[PDB]
Swiss-Prot record, chain A:
Residue window of the full protein shown: 2 to 97 of 118
GO BP of this protein: positive regulation of proteasomal ubiquitin-dependent protein catabolic process; protein ubiquitination; protein-containing complex assembly; target-directed miRNA degradation; transcription elongation by RNA polymerase II; transcription initiation at RNA polymerase II promoter
Domain of life of the source: Eukaryota
Name the record gives this protein: Elongin-B
Family according to the record: Belongs to the Elongin B family.
UniProt source species: Homo sapiens (Human)
Subunit structure: Heterotrimer of an A (ELOA, ELOA2 or ELOA3P), ELOB and ELOC subunit. The elongin BC complex interacts with EPOP; leading to recruit the elongin BC complex to Polycomb group (PcG) target genes, thereby restricting excessive activity of the PRC2/EED-EZH2 complex. (Microbial infection) Following infection by HIV-1 virus, component of a cullin-5-RING E3 ubiquitin-protein ligase complex (ECS complex) hijacked by the HIV-1 Vif protein.
Classification of source organism: Eukaryota, Metazoa, Chordata, Craniata, Vertebrata
From Swiss-Prot, chain B:
Expression sites (tissue/organ): Widely expressed. Highly expressed in testis. Weakly expressed in other tissues.
Name of the molecule in the record: Protein fem-1 homolog B
Family: Belongs to the fem-1 family.
Location of the protein in the cell: Cytoplasm; Nucleus
Portion of the full-length sequence here: 472 to 627 of 627
Function: Substrate-recognition component of a Cul2-RING (CRL2) E3 ubiquitin-protein ligase complex of the DesCEND (destruction via C-end degrons) pathway, which recognizes a C-degron located at the extreme C terminus of target proteins, leading to their ubiquitination and degradation. The C-degron recognized by the DesCEND pathway is usually a motif of less than ten residues and can be present in full-length proteins, truncated proteins or proteolytically cleaved forms.
Oligomeric form and interacting partners: Component of a CRL2 E3 ubiquitin-protein ligase complex, also named ECS (Elongin BC-CUL2/5-SOCS-box protein) complex, composed of CUL2, Elongin BC (ELOB and ELOC), RBX1 and substrate-specific adapter FEM1B. Homooligomer. Interacts with PPM1F and PHTF1. Interacts with the death domain of FAS/TNFRSF6 and TNFRSF1A. Interacts with CHEK1. Interacts with NKX3-1.
ANK repeat residue intervals: 12-56, 60-97
Source species: Homo sapiens (Human)
Gene: FEM1B
UniProtKB/Swiss-Prot annotation, chain D:
Tissue expression notes: Highly expressed in heart, skeletal muscle, spleen, thymus, prostate, testis, ovary, colon and leukocytes.
Complex formation: Interacts with AHR; interaction is direct. Interacts with NUB1; interaction is direct. Interacts with ESR1.
Name of this chain's protein: Ubiquitin-like protein NEDD8
Localization, UniProt: Nucleus
From Swiss-Prot, chain E:
Tissues showing expression: Overexpressed in prostate cancer cell line PC-3 and breast cancer cell line SK-BR-3.
Assigned keywords, A-Z: Host-virus interaction, Nucleus, Transcription, Transcription regulation, Ubl conjugation, Ubl conjugation pathway
Entry-linked SUPFAM superfamilies: POZ domain
Gene Ontology molecular-function annotations: protein-macromolecule adaptor activity; transcription corepressor binding
Pfam families reported in the protein's UniProt record: Skp1_POZ
Protein's name according to its UniProt entry: Elongin-C
Record's subcellular location: Nucleus
Record text on subunit structure and interactions: Heterotrimer of an A (ELOA, ELOA2 or ELOA3P), ELOB and ELOC subunit. The elongin BC complex interacts with EPOP; leading to recruit the elongin BC complex to Polycomb group (PcG) target genes, thereby restricting excessive activity of the PRC2/EED-EZH2 complex. (Microbial infection) Interacts with HIV-1 Vif; forming an active cullin-5-RING E3 ubiquitin-protein ligase complex (ECS complex).
Pathway(s) the chain acts in: Protein modification; protein ubiquitination
SMART domains: Skp1 (SM00512)
Organism: Homo sapiens (Human)
Length: 93, 156, 227, 76, 96
């Protein structure tokens, strides 16, 4: 129901999910494509933290904002807790 | 094929396809109008299997797709409006190409049946959206974009 | 950088594109980064300012493919006894070579070839394989294709893969002709093999008319049909 | 109410749907006789295509009429 | 599977393969030499196209996968007028 981009630092994984689906599904999905244990990354919304229990559609990631033509930027930071390091895109002309 | 490659164009810019998809093309009353009916989907089909330039522009900038959606008889002969449109957009008739007066063929619908047929046959492409966004804001593109892309910008 | 058209000289970039496309049509090893940069090269040369030189690149690809298929022809002619084992070895490495060259030249086939009479590279590489590797080397191919299948008919079990590759190298070459896609195979291998089969079964039936009576003739003809 | 919707060759489709029947499944019954699956017969209600429930009173609640349908595939 | 897209200056992207094959020169870059025995990343190195335009074309991949042959209103793709010119060049290079 929602479309989000998992933007960790350099990479930005584009994925679809559901309102009823939870954070654990997100972490399971990003495990097989980034090879990171779930406790080594903490997700975000702007700067607000999230946990592994609340649903994806709960913490402001609704179908009216995580639409695919402008997905909601969910931030990630990986453990070696490190800060949420996200660098912006290139300069538009 | 020979005639098409000799590019037959009337004074209005109409090619063979433009007249073959136009109901306004006069058909001879002397023993002929009872047989030859315009627009006809068969002739258009036979004009696309022979390789007519389907994205041709007339004096008004209308393509064959612009002309066919101007048809005002979607009930009397629906198939001759349907079986031609699928015949028109099958060789690369750019559904979003825009005439000289800045009218998309969706804009020149004048018919719910024709516009819904175009919408069903329309396939989206980021090329089309990006070109439309470029022209809707009038960014200078000449001598900055590919040479083949200037014509595509002029299409939208 | 970027996708903006730039004045690029054709010489060293075309040589550096040859460095990869020669290995592509031989099914050799090319790096993924190299193969993904040749796409950018082909795009840059396809819209290069101030003259879009896709025509020069198209003609140079014509020249390279013609020379390469003629080299394959001269090499296959040397192995006169085993040309089938050499033709099919140089066709499995050129059919996929033609397909990969078509993939590499994807932007050319949708900007300069189909939009301006001209043949797309996946159709040109195959059309350079019948015009320069099958049409001139036709009788040698066909007569011994019939000879190998006749040896299979009598008692032998020749290389099924080689024959089944050379034979479909007549329907595969004409895969890009929308009108009569089998026409080359319908006049290079269909009719000659049909007439040779007719002669061979005529003499086979004549031989089995006198060898056995009408009872065993039924079982023998049924077995020969099943075979 | 039986329908007389035209087709790609001047045929007929029997919707057998009353004016209060929604066109969400009314087109399915019409296409059941013709053969098309429910979510593929993009019928045109003399100027527009029915969407979602689309109770037949929207299309003038006509009896029988002639609804030229589109053969739009991949809509399932 | 999931495919991987380099940008001009870092800015890694990862899009589902069925989503990134809607373009034209990804289906060609992914049909090249090599059997792709790994089948997990098969990264493509877009050396020339910048990062923001690559993000927008990935968003377009998701958009076109979601809204293909739909009976809805097909909500408009938002194009920044600054990114409009470069995205046009990308959608020229990235066929469709």
């Amino acid at each position: 129901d929602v479309f989000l981009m998992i933007r960790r630092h350099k990479t930005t994984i584009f994925t679809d999910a559901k309102e009823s689906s939870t954070v654990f599904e997100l972490k399971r999905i990003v495990e097989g494509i980034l090879k990171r244990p779930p406790d080594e990354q903490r997700l975000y919304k702007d700067d607000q933290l999230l946990d592994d229990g609340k649903t994806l559609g709960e913490c402001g990631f609704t179908s009216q904002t995580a639409r695919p033509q402008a997905p909601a930027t969910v931030g990630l930071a990986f453990r070696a807790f490190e800060a949420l390091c996200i660098e912006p895109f290139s300069s538009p002309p | 094929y020979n005639l098409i490659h000799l590019d037959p164009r009337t004074r209005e810019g109409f090619t063979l396809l433009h007249l073959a998809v136009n109901s306004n093309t006069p058909v001879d009353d002397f023993h002929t109008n009872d047989v030859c009916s315009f627009p006809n989907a068969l002739v258009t089909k036979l004009l696309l299997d022979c390789g007519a330039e389907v994205n041709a522009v007339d004096n008004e900038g209308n393509s064959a797709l612009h002309i066919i959606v101007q048809y005002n008889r979607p009930i009397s002969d629906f198939l001759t409006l349907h079986s031609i449109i699928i015949s028109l957009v099958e060789a690369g008739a750019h559904t979003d190409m825009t005439n000289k007066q800045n009218k998309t063929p969706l804009d020149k619908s004048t018919t719910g049946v024709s516009e819904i047929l175009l919408k069903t046959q329309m396939k989206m492409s980021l090329k089309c959206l990006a070109a439309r966004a470029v022209r809707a804001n009038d960014i200078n593109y000449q001598d900055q974009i590919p040479r083949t892309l200037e014509e595509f910008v002029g299409f939208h | 950088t970027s996708l903006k058209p730039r004045v690029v000289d054709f010489d060293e970039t075309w040589n550096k594109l040859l460095t990869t496309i020669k290995a592509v049509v031989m099914l050799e090893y090319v790096e993924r980064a190299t193969w993904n940069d040749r796409f950018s090269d082909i795009y840059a040369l396809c819209v290069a300012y101030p003259e879009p030189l896709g025509e020069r690149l198209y003609t140079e690809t014509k020249i390279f493919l013609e020379n390469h298929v003629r080299h394959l022809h001269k090499r296959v002619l040397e192995s006169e006894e085993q040309v089938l084992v050499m033709y099919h070895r140089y066709w499995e490495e050129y059919s996929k070579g033609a397909d990969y060259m078509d993939c590499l030249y994807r932007y050319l086939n949708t900007q300069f070839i189909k939009k301006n009479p001209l043949m797309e590279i996946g159709e040109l590489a195959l059309d350079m394989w019948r015009k320069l590797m099958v049409e001139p080397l036709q009788a040698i191919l066909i007569r011994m294709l019939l000879r190998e299948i006749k040896n299979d008919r009598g008692g032998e079990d020749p290389n099924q893969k080689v024959i089944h590759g050379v034979i479909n190298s007549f329907v595969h070459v004409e895969q890009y002709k929308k009108k009569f896609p089998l026409k080359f195979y319908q006049e290079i291998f269909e009719s000659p093999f049909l007439t040779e089969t007719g002669e061979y079964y005529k003499q086979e039936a004549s031989n089995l008319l006198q060898e056995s009576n009408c009872s065993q003739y039924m079982e023998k003809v049924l077995g020969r049909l099943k075979d | 109410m039986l329908i007389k919707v035209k087709t790609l060759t001047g045929k007929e489709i029997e919707i057998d749907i009353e004016p209060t029947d929604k066109v969400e499944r009314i087109k399915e019954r019409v296409e059941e006789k013709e053969g098309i699956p429910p979510q593929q017969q993009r019928l045109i209600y003399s100027g527009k295509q029915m969407n979602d429930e689309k109770t037949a009173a929207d299309y003038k609640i006509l009896g029988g009429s002639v609804l030229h349908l589109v053969l739009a595939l991949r809509g399932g | 599977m999931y495919v991987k897209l380099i940008s001009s200056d870092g800015h890694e992207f990862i899009v589902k393969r069925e989503h990134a094959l809607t373009s034209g020169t990804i289906k060609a870059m992914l049909s090249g030499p090599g059997q792709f025995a790994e089948n997990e990343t098969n990264e493509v190195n877009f050396r020339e196209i910048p990062s923001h335009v690559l993000s927008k074309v990935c968003m377009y991949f998701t958009y076109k996968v979601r809204y293909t042959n739909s009976s809805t209103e097909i909500p408009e793709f938002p194009i920044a007028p600054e990114i409009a010119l470069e995205l046009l060049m990308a959608a020229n290079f990235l066929d469709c």
